[PDB]
Structure 1
Amino acid sequence: SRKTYTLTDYLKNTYRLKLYSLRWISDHEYLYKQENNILVFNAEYGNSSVFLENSTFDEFGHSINDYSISPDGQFILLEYNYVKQWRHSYTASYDIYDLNKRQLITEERIPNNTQWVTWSPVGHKLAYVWNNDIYVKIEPNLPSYRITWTGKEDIIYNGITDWVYEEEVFSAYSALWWSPNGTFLAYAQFNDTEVPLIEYSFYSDESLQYPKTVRVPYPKAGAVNPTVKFFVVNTDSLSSVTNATSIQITAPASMLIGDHYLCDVTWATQERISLQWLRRIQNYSVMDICDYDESSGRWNCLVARQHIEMSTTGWVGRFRPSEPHFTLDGNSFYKIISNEEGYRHICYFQIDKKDCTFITKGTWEVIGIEALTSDYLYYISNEYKGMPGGRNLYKIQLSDYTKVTCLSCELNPERCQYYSVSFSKEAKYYQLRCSGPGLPLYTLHSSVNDKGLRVLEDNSALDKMLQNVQMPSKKLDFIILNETKFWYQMILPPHFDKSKKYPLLLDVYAGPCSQKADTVFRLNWATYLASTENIIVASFDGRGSGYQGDKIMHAINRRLGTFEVEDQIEAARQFSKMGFVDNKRIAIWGWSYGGYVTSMVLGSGSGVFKCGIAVAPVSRWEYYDSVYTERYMGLPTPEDNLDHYRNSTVMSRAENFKQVEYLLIHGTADDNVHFQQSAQISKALVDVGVDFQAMWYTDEDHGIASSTAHQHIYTHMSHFIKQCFSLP
C-alpha cells in the first residue's frame, strides 16, 4: 500500500489506537471523559450530558493529573504534584472540590505527599495514608482521624504495600479495604524491619555533585520477608476525644508455623470479610471467613468455614490464590480452582460446607469471573474454537449449570477473538471491548436479553489510516512437540512470499504462566521490523506457559531456566526447517523474564542463533525477589533447592557466548531486576574473554520508559539487528 510502518512511527506514535475507558457510577450510568469534558451517559437510552467542564478548573494553579468523584457525585477529588515511585505506588497532592457550590474546600486539606487516597464505595468518606499512617475523614471539610501511629519510613507500612507486596502480591500500592457499607475500614500492616536493603546509585541532574544512594527493603530469594498483620476499624464509631480501636484479625494457626503472606482481601457483606493466606512455600493457602459480632465489637473466624487450597504439582493459583466472587446474601461464593485434571474452572463453595462443586469443566480454562446476578454468573474463558490465545464472554444459568451462552463469540468472528468486559453495578449492562485480531471495537449491551445497544468506538479513523500502510499480517497456528500442541504467532512482512527467505527474530518472554501467542492486535516494535525490515518476528508459548492447564504450566516447577529455555530453541529449530526462514539469520530478544531466557538461550551451544538482545535480564535467581522466585523455585537452601539455583545461572554458560553476538542492556536505576544481575553477566563474559556489546541507561528503571530513553533503546536495538542481519 506504498507507505511502510516505520521506526519513527512506533516511537512517535503516528497511529494511536482509540479506547473507551468508562467508569460506571451505578446500575445504568457511566462517566466518560471526552478530551477534557467529563460526561455522564445513560446506558439504557444512550442520552448523556456535561457533568463537569474541561474549563471548570482553569484558575486552580496546578496542572491536574486525575480526578476521583465521590460515589454520590457530591465531591470531586483533584490529584496534583504527582511524583511516581515503583510500578503502582506514587505520591500526590490533593484537593476536594464541592460540586453543590462553586468551591474548593479550604479547611483541613489532605496533606502533600499522600501515598494513597480513596473514597468509600458509598457516600463521601475518605481514607488516606500519610507518612506510612492511615487517616480517616467522614466529612471532606472536617479534621481527619488517625488510625495508626506505628508508621515509619521503610520499616512499618500501615495501609500501604512495601516493595514485594506492591509488585508480587497485591498488584497495588493499596492495602486499604472499605466494607460496602462504608462502615468498616480494613487494612494490612507490614513490618519491614529486618528486610535487607538493595542499594544502588541514582545520579540525578547533572548539577548533582555527588550521586545519591537509593536504599530499598527488598527480600531477594531466601532472605527475610516482611511480616504482615490485619485489622478492622469502625468508621461510624470514631471518637475525636479518644484514640481509635483497630481490631486485629490474626492468621490461621496453620499459617503461624512459619513465614507466610496475606495474599487476598475480599469483603462479602456489610459484616463479613474473606481473607486469604499463603504459606512461604507457596503450595498451601487458607481462606478464612470472618463475621462481625455486634455485641462484643469483635471479629471471629470460625474454623468451620476455613477452606484450603494446596497444589500437589506446583503452586496455588496462577500467580496467587484466585479471587472469590460472593453471592449477595453472603453464604456462598464462586472461585476458580485447578480441577482434578489440572485445568482451571469455576468452583462453587458454600460457607459451612465441605469441598466444592465445579460448574465448568473441559480442556480449556476460565480466565476470570466477571459478574454475578441471581440467575447467572458471567465469566471470560478461552473455550471458543479451542484457542488458548482467545478470550470470550460466557454466561451460565445458575439453576442449571449445563446452560451456557456465548455472549461474544458470534458478534464479529473475523475482527474479534479477544474480549474483556466491564459490567454495570448489579450487572444490568456491560461494555464489551474487543482487542483483536482486528482493530479494538468498544460496544455496549444489556444483560436483560443480551441486546447490542450501541457501538461506542470502532477505530474507523485509524482503520482508514492503516489502509495507506503496508501493514504486517499476523499468523497464529501451533506446533506439536510430544503429543502436545504449543502455540506460536508470527508477525509477517507485507506482500509476504513463502517462496522467499526471511530473517527471524524470536520474541520471547516465556516466564511462568505467560502467553505471547495471542489474537490481540498490537502496534509495536515488532510491527516495524516486519513492515519496514521484512523481518519475521515470531513468539512461542511452550512449557510453563499459562491457560493450558497445570501439565504445561507446572512443567517448570522448582526448575526455571530448563524447559522454557529448551523449548524456545526447539520452536526455532522448527521455524528454521520451514522454507521461508533463512537459518543463518535467526535472532532472539527479551525483556525481564524474557531477557533471562534469551541469555540462557544464547549460552546454550544451540548452533541456532546468530545473535540476540537481552534487556534488564535476570541472571541468577538468588538476586531476584522472594515472593516471585520462591513461588517457582523453593528456597536456596541445601536441603530444599540450592542445587538448581546454582545450575541455572547466566554466568555458568558464559563460555558459550563465544559462538554468538550478544547485546546486553540495563537501566542503572532498576529497583526491580537490579543492575547487579547484568553486572554479574558482564563480569563472567569478561573473566572468560568473550566479546559482546553493551548499553546502560543511567537513571532508567525496569521499564526504560522515559520518552527519550525509550526512543534510544529501540534505535540501538534496531541498528544491532539490522547490522546482525546485513540490512541496509
Structure 2
Amino acid sequence: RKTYTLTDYLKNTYRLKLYSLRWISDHEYLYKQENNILVFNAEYGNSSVFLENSTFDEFGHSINDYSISPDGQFILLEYNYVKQWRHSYTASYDIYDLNKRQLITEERIPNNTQWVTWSPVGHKLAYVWNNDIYVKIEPNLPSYRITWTGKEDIIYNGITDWVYEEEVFSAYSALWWSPNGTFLAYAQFNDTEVPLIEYSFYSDESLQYPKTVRVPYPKAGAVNPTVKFFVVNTDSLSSVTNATSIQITAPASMLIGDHYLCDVTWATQERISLQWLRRIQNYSVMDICDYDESSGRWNCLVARQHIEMSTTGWVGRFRPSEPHFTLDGNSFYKIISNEEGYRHICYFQIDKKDCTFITKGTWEVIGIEALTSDYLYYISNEYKGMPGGRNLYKIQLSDYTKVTCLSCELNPERCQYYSVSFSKEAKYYQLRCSGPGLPLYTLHSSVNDKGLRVLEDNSALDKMLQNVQMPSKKLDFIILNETKFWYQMILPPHFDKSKKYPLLLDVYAGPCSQKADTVFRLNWATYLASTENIIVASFDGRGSGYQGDKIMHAINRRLGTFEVEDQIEAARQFSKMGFVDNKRIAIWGWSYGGYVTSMVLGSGSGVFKCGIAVAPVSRWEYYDSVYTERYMGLPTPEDNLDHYRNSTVMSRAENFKQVEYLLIHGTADDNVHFQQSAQISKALVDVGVDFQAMWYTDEDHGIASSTAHQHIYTHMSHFIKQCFSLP
C-alpha cells in the first residue's frame, strides 16, 4: 500500500481544486474554465460564456492575466510579465473593446508599466510608468500625465518603495480612486537618503561579469523614506494645463518626526480616511478629510482625529486596523483591542468621542468582512474556543446581543476554518472551508442565509487520497503556568502511541503567528509523516496571535526570548508524552522560523539532535525598519540597543558544537539578505564548530523557482533522514 511521497509533494500528484471567482456586481461573478471566462448568476446558478478561450489565439503574446472594466465594456490584457518583489512587477498591456470586438491600437499603454487600475465604476484608467502617474479617461485617447517628479530608486509616485510594498501596504499600488471615479488619491515616497542593500546577481552563464543589485532598503534604525499624500480631480483634466494635485498634510502630531502613512480609505465621494503611524509604532492618528466644493481643497478638522496608543505593545496585529465605513460615511467600525487585551469590533461615530464595543469575549475577531444596513459580517475564532478555527458570523446592528454563526454548523466535522467573499452590496457570499477536511466551496444568499449550491467539493481528490496511506492531524493544547498553549501534530498513518517516533518541530513563532490550526494542507510535512513516519509538530507559544495581548505582547521589545523558550519547553512536553523518541528530536523553520530555529539550536538545551534554518534572521539590525522597530524599538543606547545585541544568533555560536546544523539561504534574497547567513557561518567558523550548508544561486527569500524548490526539499529530506537514521 502506498504513501504520500516526496515526489508526490514535489510533482503535485494529488492536486487541491479551488474556486476563484470575481464578483462583478451584486449578483454575478466571473469564473475561468478551460480558459473560457464565464459569467455566473448567483441567484439561479445559470451561466454563459463571457469570453471564449479562442479569442486571442492570434495575439502573439502569452497572456498573464486579465482585467475587465467595471462596466463590462473593456478588458485589460496583461503580458510580458516580469516579477520584482513580493507584489511588484512590470508588464505590457493591451485593451480590447468588447462591444466592437477589437484590440485598441490608439494611445496604448506603454511597455514596462508598473501598475494599472480601472476606476471603480466606468472604464477610466490610472497607471504608473517610470515612477509617474498617468490617467486615460477613455482607452483610445491620449493620457494625461499627473506627476513629473518620478525617478528610479528615488521618487515613487503612485507605487511603493521596497519597505512600503513589503511591510505597510502589502502591495505595489499606491493609488486610490474615490468610489465615483472622480478623484484619484495617491502617495509619494522619497527614498533619497535611504541606504542601499547591495548584492550580486550572477544570471545566465553567458554573463561574464556579475551584476550588482542595489535596492533602497532601510535597515533597523536607518534613514526611512518620507511620504506625501495627494488628491487629483479626474473630471477637470486639461489637455493644455497640467493636473493640479492637491496635497493633504499629515497631522502635526506626526510631522514632529519620522512617521508612516499606513492606511487609505475613501469613506464617501468627498470623505477620505487617512491613518498615520509614528516611527515609534505605539501611536497612530486617523484623519477625516472632507472635500470643499468652493476652495477645491481638502480639510481634516483636527477636532475629528481618532487616536490610538498601546502600552503593552505596538498598534494592531501588524498595523493599525482597517476602518469599515457605514454607507453615509458618518460612522465606521474597526477592530480594536479591548480593556482585557482582546481584539473586538468597535463602533465609531465621526465627531463623537470614544467608540462602542459591539462584540466581546475571550476570543478575537479576525476580520470585518461586510456591512449592510442591518448586519455587520465578520470572521472570528469564537466557536468552541478554538483560537485556530475561523467561522463566519453576523451581528444585528439594531441589537448587538443577536449574533448568528453562519458557518459553525454547515458541516461541523469537515469544516472548522472559513474565509468568505461577498458580492457588491453583499446580497450573496461565497464560503470557503479550508479544513480540517478537504476544502469546500459553497454559495449562499444573504437574505435568509440559505445554501444555494455547492461550487467545489474536492471529491476528485478525496477519491485519490482514499488509495493513499495519509497522515492524520491532532490539534490540541497543553497548560503552562496555568495557560493553554495550542499545538498541532501531523501523525503517521496507523499511528501507535505505544511506539516511539522521531519528532520534527516545525517552527515559525514570529509575533502574532499561528502554527496550530484546523487547515488541511498537502505539504512537505505530509510526506515526512506519511512515508518516513515522522511526527511533525508545531506549537504556538508566547508571542503567538489571536489569543489576546497578554500572550501576543509577551514578546514586546524582547524578540528571541519567550518565543524561543516556549518552543524548547514544548518539545520537553512532547517527549514526556509516551510516543516520542527523545533521542531523535529535530527542528526547522524558514524566515523568522530560521532565526528561532537557530536560537534554539544555540540555546544548549540538549533537546534537539539537529535542525535546519532557511533564510533566517541572524540579528535584528540586519532586517527592515518597519518590521523590526515595531517589536524592538530603535537600536540606540537610549532605546533597546542592549536587547538588539543580546539577541543575535552569532553570540551563541559555541553551543552549536552540541548539534547538527544545516544553514540554507538564497544569494539574491532581497528580504532577509544573504548577509544574515554570511554572518552566521563566519561566527561558527571563528569558534571552531562544524556544520552543513547550502547556498542557492540567484534565489530570493522564496527559493521558489521550480528547480530550486525541488532541490532544497530534496536536500533537507536527506539531512533529516541521516539525522534520524532513516532508510
TM-score range normalised by the length of the shorter chain: over 0.9
Please state whether the residue corresponding to 1:304 is helix, strand or coil. helix
1-structure distance, mates of 2:678, 2:640: 24
2-structure distance, mates of 1:73, 1:491: 47
1:649 equivalent in structure 2: 648
1-structure distance, mates of 2:152, 2:649: 35
Deviation string for 1:285-333 (max 9, x for gaps)?
A: 1000001001110000011210001111100000000001000001000
Deviation string for 1:152-176 (max 9, x for gaps)?
A: 0000000000000000000000100
Residue 97 of structure 1 deviates from its aligned partner by 0.2
Please state whether the residue corresponding to 2:461 is helix, strand or coil. helix
Residue 491 of structure 1 deviates from its aligned partner by 0.3
Within-5 A mapping of 1:204-353: 204-353=203-352
2:598 equivalent in structure 1: 599
1:390 equivalent in structure 2: 389
Query: Is structure 2 residue 367 aligned with structure 1 residue 368?
Result: yes
2-structure distance, mates of 1:216, 1:121: 33
Deviation string for 1:695-718 (max 9, x for gaps)?
A: 000100000000000000000000
Residue 3 of structure 1 deviates from its aligned partner by 1.1
Deviation string for 1:607-652 (max 9, x for gaps)?
A: 1000000000000000000000000000000010000000000000
2-structure distance, mates of 1:453, 1:44: 8
Residue 483 of structure 1 deviates from its aligned partner by 1.1
2-structure distance, mates of 1:504, 1:56: 53
2-structure distance, mates of 1:63, 1:672: 30
Residue 690 of structure 1 deviates from its aligned partner by 0.1
Please state whether the residue corresponding to 2:63 is helix, strand or coil. coil
1-structure distance, mates of 2:100, 2:197: 49
Deviation string for 1:102-143 (max 9, x for gaps)?
A: 210010110000000000110000000000000000000000
2-structure distance, mates of 1:188, 1:339: 32
Please state whether the residue corresponding to 1:286 is helix, strand or coil. strand
Q: Identity percentage over the alignment?
A: 100
Please state whether the residue corresponding to 2:366 is helix, strand or coil. strand
2:625 equivalent in structure 1: 626
2-structure distance, mates of 1:271, 1:468: 59
2:503 equivalent in structure 1: 504
1-structure distance, mates of 2:101, 2:370: 38
1-structure distance, mates of 2:15, 2:274: 41
Residue 35 of structure 1 deviates from its aligned partner by 2.5
Residue 237 of structure 1 deviates from its aligned partner by 0.6
Please state whether the residue corresponding to 1:431 is helix, strand or coil. strand
Residue 587 of structure 1 deviates from its aligned partner by 0.2
Please state whether the residue corresponding to 2:464 is helix, strand or coil. helix
Please state whether the residue corresponding to 1:498 is helix, strand or coil. coil
Residue 539 of structure 1 deviates from its aligned partner by 0.2
Deviation string for 1:450-495 (max 9, x for gaps)?
A: 1000000000000000000100000000011111101000000001
Please state whether the residue corresponding to 2:163 is helix, strand or coil. helix
Please state whether the residue corresponding to 1:652 is helix, strand or coil. helix
2-structure distance, mates of 1:544, 1:289: 33
Residue 526 of structure 1 deviates from its aligned partner by 0.2
2-structure distance, mates of 1:175, 1:480: 45
Please state whether the residue corresponding to 1:619 is helix, strand or coil. coil
Please state whether the residue corresponding to 2:554 is helix, strand or coil. helix
1:424 equivalent in structure 2: 423
1-structure distance, mates of 2:364, 2:328: 28
Deviation string for 1:536-560 (max 9, x for gaps)?
A: 0000001000000100000000000
1:575 equivalent in structure 2: 574
Q: CA RMSD in A?
A: 0.4
Residue 101 of structure 1 deviates from its aligned partner by 1.2
1-structure distance, mates of 2:276, 2:103: 42
2-structure distance, mates of 1:336, 1:304: 22
Unaligned segments of structure 2, at least 5 residues: none
Please state whether the residue corresponding to 2:205 is helix, strand or coil. coil
1-structure distance, mates of 2:575, 2:219: 39
1-structure distance, mates of 2:469, 2:323: 46
2-structure distance, mates of 1:408, 1:263: 32
1-structure distance, mates of 2:467, 2:261: 52
Residue 422 of structure 1 deviates from its aligned partner by 0.3
Deviation string for 1:155-211 (max 9, x for gaps)?
A: 000000000000000000010000000000000000000000000000000000000
1:539 equivalent in structure 2: 538
2-structure distance, mates of 1:448, 1:63: 42
Please state whether the residue corresponding to 2:664 is helix, strand or coil. strand
2-structure distance, mates of 1:438, 1:102: 44
2-structure distance, mates of 1:479, 1:193: 51
Residue 277 of structure 1 deviates from its aligned partner by 0.3
Residue 504 of structure 1 deviates from its aligned partner by 0.2
Please state whether the residue corresponding to 1:39 is helix, strand or coil. strand
Residue 664 of structure 1 deviates from its aligned partner by 0.2
Deviation string for 1:51-100 (max 9, x for gaps)?
A: 00011100011000000000011000000000000000000000000000
2-structure distance, mates of 1:120, 1:439: 37
2:693 equivalent in structure 1: 694
Deviation string for 1:218-255 (max 9, x for gaps)?
A: 00000000000000001001101100011000001100
Within-5 A mapping of 1:400-479: 400-479=399-478
1-structure distance, mates of 2:444, 2:187: 38
